[PDB]
Design an enzyme around this catalytic site. Structure first.
Site, PDB file in Angstrom:
ATOM      1  N   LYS A 195       0.935  -1.231   0.189  1.00 14.99           N
ATOM      2  CA  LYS A 195      -0.096  -0.079  -0.108  1.00 14.99           C
ATOM      3  C   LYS A 195       0.730   1.341   0.127  1.00 14.99           C
ATOM      4  O   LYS A 195       0.529   2.310  -0.561  1.00 14.99           O
ATOM      5  CB  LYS A 195      -1.076  -0.015   1.132  1.00 14.99           C
ATOM      6  CG  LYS A 195      -2.344  -0.819   0.660  1.00 14.99           C
ATOM      7  CD  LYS A 195      -2.219  -1.838  -0.129  1.00 14.99           C
ATOM      8  CE  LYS A 195      -3.497  -2.532  -0.634  1.00 14.99           C
ATOM      9  NZ  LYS A 195      -3.367  -3.281  -1.865  1.00 14.99           N
TER      10      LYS A 195
ATOM     11  N   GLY B 228      -8.595  -4.358   1.550  1.00 15.42           N
ATOM     12  CA  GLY B 228     -10.315  -4.184   1.840  1.00 15.42           C
ATOM     13  C   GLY B 228     -10.412  -3.413   3.091  1.00 15.42           C
ATOM     14  O   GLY B 228     -11.804  -2.817   3.218  1.00 15.42           O
TER      15      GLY B 228
ATOM     16  N   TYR C 151      -8.134  10.723   8.426  1.00 12.89           N
ATOM     17  CA  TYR C 151      -9.335  10.164   8.260  1.00 12.89           C
ATOM     18  C   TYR C 151     -10.462  10.952   7.954  1.00 12.89           C
ATOM     19  O   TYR C 151     -10.785  11.915   8.628  1.00 12.89           O
ATOM     20  CB  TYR C 151      -9.502   9.701  10.102  1.00 12.89           C
ATOM     21  CG  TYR C 151     -10.783   8.660  10.194  1.00 12.89           C
ATOM     22  CD1 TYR C 151     -10.742   7.439   9.325  1.00 12.89           C
ATOM     23  CD2 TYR C 151     -11.794   9.341  10.794  1.00 12.89           C
ATOM     24  CE1 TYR C 151     -12.086   6.828   9.438  1.00 12.89           C
ATOM     25  CE2 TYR C 151     -13.078   8.309  10.932  1.00 12.89           C
ATOM     26  CZ  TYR C 151     -13.010   7.168  10.183  1.00 12.89           C
ATOM     27  OH  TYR C 151     -14.279   6.375  10.266  1.00 12.89           O
TER      28      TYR C 151
ATOM     29  N   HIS D 265     -17.216   5.882  -1.426  1.00 19.37           N
ATOM     30  CA  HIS D 265     -16.211   4.990  -2.174  1.00 19.37           C
ATOM     31  C   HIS D 265     -16.620   4.985  -3.558  1.00 19.37           C
ATOM     32  O   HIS D 265     -17.467   4.450  -4.122  1.00 19.37           O
ATOM     33  CB  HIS D 265     -16.313   3.591  -1.711  1.00 19.37           C
ATOM     34  CG  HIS D 265     -15.099   2.499  -1.887  1.00 19.37           C
ATOM     35  ND1 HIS D 265     -15.478   1.408  -1.703  1.00 19.37           N
ATOM     36  CD2 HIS D 265     -13.813   2.898  -2.318  1.00 19.37           C
ATOM     37  CE1 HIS D 265     -13.962   0.775  -2.154  1.00 19.37           C
ATOM     38  NE2 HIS D 265     -13.226   1.648  -2.331  1.00 19.37           N
TER      39      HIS D 265
ATOM     40  N   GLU E 246      -6.122   2.968  -2.784  1.00 20.66           N
ATOM     41  CA  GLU E 246      -5.421   1.625  -3.250  1.00 20.66           C
ATOM     42  C   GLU E 246      -5.930   1.198  -4.777  1.00 20.66           C
ATOM     43  O   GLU E 246      -6.940   1.644  -5.307  1.00 20.66           O
ATOM     44  CB  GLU E 246      -5.676   0.618  -2.243  1.00 20.66           C
ATOM     45  CG  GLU E 246      -7.323   0.037  -2.184  1.00 20.66           C
ATOM     46  CD  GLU E 246      -7.326  -0.786  -1.007  1.00 20.66           C
ATOM     47  OE1 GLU E 246      -7.564  -1.939  -1.140  1.00 20.66           O
ATOM     48  OE2 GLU E 246      -7.128  -0.461   0.181  1.00 20.66           O
TER      49      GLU E 246
ATOM     50  N   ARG F  49      -6.877  -6.455 -10.785  1.00 23.58           N
ATOM     51  CA  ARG F  49      -7.594  -7.557 -11.335  1.00 23.58           C
ATOM     52  C   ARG F  49      -9.097  -6.958 -11.789  1.00 23.58           C
ATOM     53  O   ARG F  49      -9.253  -5.895 -11.509  1.00 23.58           O
ATOM     54  CB  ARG F  49      -8.097  -8.471 -10.193  1.00 23.58           C
ATOM     55  CG  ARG F  49      -8.827  -8.062  -9.073  1.00 23.58           C
ATOM     56  CD  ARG F  49      -8.949  -8.947  -7.845  1.00 23.58           C
ATOM     57  NE  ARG F  49      -9.950  -8.232  -6.864  1.00 23.58           N
ATOM     58  CZ  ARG F  49      -9.827  -7.433  -5.790  1.00 23.58           C
ATOM     59  NH1 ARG F  49      -8.458  -7.304  -5.779  1.00 23.58           N
ATOM     60  NH2 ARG F  49     -10.647  -6.992  -5.041  1.00 23.58           N
TER      61      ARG F  49
ATOM     62  N   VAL G 237     -15.505  -8.013  -9.033  1.00 27.52           N
ATOM     63  CA  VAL G 237     -17.115  -8.222  -9.261  1.00 27.52           C
ATOM     64  C   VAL G 237     -17.992  -7.240  -9.675  1.00 27.52           C
ATOM     65  O   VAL G 237     -18.895  -7.740 -10.613  1.00 27.52           O
ATOM     66  CB  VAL G 237     -17.586  -8.535  -7.571  1.00 27.52           C
ATOM     67  CG1 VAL G 237     -19.119  -8.765  -7.687  1.00 27.52           C
ATOM     68  CG2 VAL G 237     -16.964  -9.574  -6.679  1.00 27.52           C
TER      69      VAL G 237
ATOM     70  N   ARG H 197     -25.787  -7.336  -5.496  1.00 25.73           N
ATOM     71  CA  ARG H 197     -25.301  -8.769  -5.360  1.00 25.73           C
ATOM     72  C   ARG H 197     -26.261  -9.670  -4.828  1.00 25.73           C
ATOM     73  O   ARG H 197     -26.948  -9.254  -3.648  1.00 25.73           O
ATOM     74  CB  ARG H 197     -23.931  -8.529  -4.315  1.00 25.73           C
ATOM     75  CG  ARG H 197     -22.976  -7.767  -4.987  1.00 25.73           C
ATOM     76  CD  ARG H 197     -21.570  -7.943  -4.343  1.00 25.73           C
ATOM     77  NE  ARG H 197     -20.513  -7.165  -4.811  1.00 25.73           N
ATOM     78  CZ  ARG H 197     -19.216  -7.236  -4.275  1.00 25.73           C
ATOM     79  NH1 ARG H 197     -18.733  -8.256  -3.722  1.00 25.73           N
ATOM     80  NH2 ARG H 197     -18.339  -6.509  -4.928  1.00 25.73           N
TER      81      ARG H 197
HETATM   82  C1  LIG Z   1      -9.451   0.844   2.508  1.00 30.82           C
HETATM   83  C2  LIG Z   1     -10.328   1.859   3.480  1.00 30.82           C
HETATM   84  N1  LIG Z   1      -9.609   3.192   3.780  1.00 30.82           N
HETATM   85  C3  LIG Z   1     -10.629   3.638   4.379  1.00 30.82           C
HETATM   86  C4  LIG Z   1     -10.637   4.936   4.919  1.00 30.82           C
HETATM   87  C5  LIG Z   1     -11.733   5.743   5.559  1.00 30.82           C
HETATM   88  C6  LIG Z   1     -11.639   7.070   6.240  1.00 30.82           C
HETATM   89  N2  LIG Z   1     -10.241   7.775   5.979  1.00 30.82           N
HETATM   90  C7  LIG Z   1      -9.213   7.062   5.341  1.00 30.82           C
HETATM   91  N3  LIG Z   1      -8.053   7.696   5.226  1.00 30.82           N
HETATM   92  N4  LIG Z   1      -9.501   6.002   5.035  1.00 30.82           N
HETATM   93  C8  LIG Z   1     -11.510   2.670   4.618  1.00 30.82           C
HETATM   94  N5  LIG Z   1     -11.467   1.594   4.092  1.00 30.82           N
HETATM   95  C9  LIG Z   1     -12.053   0.514   4.111  1.00 30.82           C
HETATM   96  C10 LIG Z   1     -13.719   0.751   3.582  1.00 30.82           C
HETATM   97  C11 LIG Z   1     -13.797   1.091   2.318  1.00 30.82           C
HETATM   98 CL1  LIG Z   1     -12.686   1.459   1.013  1.00 30.82          CL
HETATM   99  C12 LIG Z   1     -15.311   1.340   1.564  1.00 30.82           C
HETATM  100  C13 LIG Z   1     -16.251   1.172   2.898  1.00 30.82           C
HETATM  101  C14 LIG Z   1     -16.072   0.884   4.208  1.00 30.82           C
HETATM  102  C15 LIG Z   1     -14.445   0.603   4.540  1.00 30.82           C
HETATM  103 CL2  LIG Z   1     -14.223   0.144   6.129  1.00 30.82          CL
HETATM  104 CL   LIG Z   2     -13.653  -7.996  -6.594  1.00 28.49          CL
END
Ligand SMILES: Cc1nc(-c2ccnc(N)n2)cn1Cc1c(Cl)cccc1Cl
Ligand SMILES: [Cl-]
Length: 446
Positions: free
Chosen positions: A116, A165, A203, A209, A288, A292, A295, A338
């Site tokens: 990462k 993940g 954070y 996402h 990240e 690949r 889904v 899904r």
């Molecule tokens: C890989 C990752 N990074 C985060 C995050 C959340 C808030 N701030 C930062 N910097 N990273 C969350 N996640 C995992 C994730 C993701 Cl990528 C989507 C939904 C839930 C969760 Cl737990």
């Molecule tokens: Cl996947």
């Protein structure tokens, strides 16, 4: 075009790959566990090889058995699908060392994006916006770690460099908890990857996402195929995905897309790939890359007309990209639900025999599943048994179609999450669009 390939996977994605192979005149070898003899794609394949017993360790993760199957059949390439060995750099390396084509990027590239910290460093260098962070591994100097946190600004998050993940991370909200949080993340990482390397990011409290689909031929050509919103999720498992992402303008799409494509060129990327971003307050932050096919690839296919699997196979045969960026056009909207064989109260996998099955049909309805009437869902693998994808000229049409397709779907004999999917389609906040990554769990807690 590749003469013959091993489909190194199972279930819906193995069927998806088989269909693309057949379209291209590519011979198929279905490798399967002893529990998977009656998989639809196995029954449809040109050749079949039982590669081991039910547990994945001795079948779908069994590198020597999968390579022997390629050897015995004279296959020229291996498609890893998603999950299993698809991000395993050692497998890719062994595949090429054994004298077969790996349908994916170079092993070096898998290794680079698998780490990462190195991945983020490469993306930052290339001009891809990343989360404000440590830009390197955290050491043992707590003064230095406090300074990083202050520069970034609390809250911060400690993440494992091996991790995938969202595995084993912790939010820190002040200096008081920083030392212990770094310490603890380090320990959980040691157990998971035998790698205690951690890093720090700002954070983000309520992000979406959002991920960008790319294709690259390894010849310098690289295109972006818009984005997908994958925010609707429960305990690190996506539940609903859609394309394009609501609220994303053509300008933002073009801005982020061009940066991803340029990064592909910078790293010598080859094949399909996904840049995962967090999206908050109109801003993209790279977290990240998946090297690949995923889904949720079908929603991207519906809105662009590009067959991503056939592209993977073309690229693996050493062909250049079949289309230019200017020819890629976002049209309409797609939503994927899904379908999981799971108990609605425990959310545990619910395997068993399907006694009656009917797939939905109609305009804009795409059904991706290996399941059939009389098929037994084995206990040994993931709970996802199918994917229902509905397209429309706009998001409202796609959702309305999904509601009707879900009601039309019949899977008797086992427990499924169909009723939950119906609930989500009827959710007023989902109907508005743009719900964040925490939404479904918050909704289900009410
Ligand atoms: C890989 C990752 N990074 C985060 C995050 C959340 C808030 N701030 C930062 N910097 N990273 C969350 N996640 C995992 C994730 C993701 Cl990528 C989507 C939904 C839930 C969760 Cl737990
Ligand atoms: Cl996947």
């Amino acid at each position: 075009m590749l003469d013959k390939i091993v489909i190194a996977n199972r279930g819906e994605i193995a069927l998806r790959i088989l269909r693309a192979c057949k379209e291209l005149g590519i011979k198929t070898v279905a490798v399967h566990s002893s529990a998977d003899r009656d998989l639809k794609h196995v029954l449809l394949a040109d050749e079949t090889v039982c590669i081991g017993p039910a547990p994945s360790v001795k079948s779908y993760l069994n590198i020597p058995a999968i390579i022997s199957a390629a050897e015995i059949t004279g296959a020229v390439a291996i498609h890893p699908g998603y999950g299993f060995l698809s991000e395993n750099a050692n497998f890719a390396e062994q595949v090429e060392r054994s004298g077969f084509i790996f349908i994916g990027p170079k092993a070096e590239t898998i290794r680079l994006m698998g780490d990462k910290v190195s991945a983020i460093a490469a993306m930052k260098k290339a001009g891809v916006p990343c989360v404000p962070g440590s830009d390197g591994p955290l050491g043992d100097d707590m003064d230095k770690n406090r300074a990083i946190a202050k520069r970034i600004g609390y809250p911060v998050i400690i993440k494992a460099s091996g991790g995938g993940g969202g595995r084993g991370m912790r939010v820190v909200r002040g200096d008081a908890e920083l030392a212990q949080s770094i310490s603890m993340t380090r320990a959980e990482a040691k157990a998971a990857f035998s790698n205690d390397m951690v890093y720090m990011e700002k954070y983000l409290e309520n992000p979406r996402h959002v991920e960008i689909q790319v294709l690259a031929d390894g010849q310098g050509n690289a295109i972006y195929l818009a984005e997908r919103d994958c925010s609707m999720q429960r305990r690190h498992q996506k539940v609903v995905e859609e394309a394009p992402a609501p609220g994303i303008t053509p300008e933002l799409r073009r801005y982020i897309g061009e940066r991803c494509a340029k990064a592909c060129v910078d790293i010598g990327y080859r094949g399909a790939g996904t840049f995962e971003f967090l999206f908050e307050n109109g801003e993209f932050y790279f977290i990240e890359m998946n090297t690949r096919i995923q889904v949720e690839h079908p929603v991207t296919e519906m809105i662009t007309g590009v067959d991503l699997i056939k592209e993977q196979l073309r690229i693996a045969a050493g062909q250049p990209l079949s289309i230019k960026q200017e020819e890629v056009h976002v049209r309409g909207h797609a939503v994927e639900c899904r379908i999981n064989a799971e108990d609605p109260n425990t959310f545990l996998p619910s395997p068993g025999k399907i006694t009656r099955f009917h797939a939905p049909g109609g305009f804009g309805v795409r059904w991706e599943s290996h399941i059939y009437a009389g098929y037994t869902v084995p206990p040994y693998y993931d709970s996802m048994i199918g994917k229902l994808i509905c397209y429309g000229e706009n998001r409202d049409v796609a959702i309305a179609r999904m509601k009707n397709a879900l009601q039309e779907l019949i899977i008797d004999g086992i427990k499924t999450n169909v009723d939950l999917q119906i609930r989500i389609m009827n959710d007023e906040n989902f109907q508005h669009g743009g719900t964040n990554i925490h939404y479904l769990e918050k909704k289900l807690g009410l």
